[PDB]
Amino acid sequence: SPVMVLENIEPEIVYAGTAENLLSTLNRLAGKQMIQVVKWAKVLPGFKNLPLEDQITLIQYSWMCLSSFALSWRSYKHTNSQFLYFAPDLVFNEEKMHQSAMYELCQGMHQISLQFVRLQLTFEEYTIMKVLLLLSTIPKDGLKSQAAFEEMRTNYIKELRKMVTWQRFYQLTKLLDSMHDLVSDLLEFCFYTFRESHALKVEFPAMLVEIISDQLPKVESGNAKPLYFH
């Protein structure tokens, strides 16, 4: 059953409208995308039944994984992965990557987009993997309904199996582990531009200000335990 509902609840499109200007713009796009993210999550099978608290945590702990992974999907569906399709009005060229002073991070997300096309990823696999990323980062000590959380997660994993079936399941779950590596780098650059936003002149909406404000204190503390498949 999950296969369908997941596919029916997929979001639409969001617009974005020197490093400082670009970065600030991306943080704007991010804040708007986030409501899109929350709408998609609220009606997610299994997930929606967890206490409200657990849903917030899971989201804030994965907002970057979800933003990054989704960008790749978009860069793959709209440009054959030859560009970074952040939004219809903001597609990154080799140049803007440099222009953004976030080049290698950009190359990082781009390389994910390259796997998608190389692997010929399908929307079904994407949907399930997206859910998995939403359930891959949890507090070091757990959540209020841990057992419920674990059962649900292992089920989405089995769901991805039935989906792919075995090199496929490996290639797909290894890419998700990879996502963890890229997301740690992004978050460091984020915590930096955030911490020194006034010195760099980098802006943050308010949704992001409240997500990042809880995030780094506990992430730089080692409390955000990433879940790996391999």
Ligand SMILES: C[C@]12CC[C@H]3[C@@H](CCC4=CC(=O)CC[C@@]43C)[C@@H]1CC[C@@H]2C(=O)CO
């Ligand atoms: C958080 C960030 C700006 C916003 C983006 C993020 C990378 C992933 C991403 C993809 C999107 O489609 C929406 C914007 C966004 C969420 C960047 C990594 C570092 C950068 C900064 O730290 C600039 O302040």
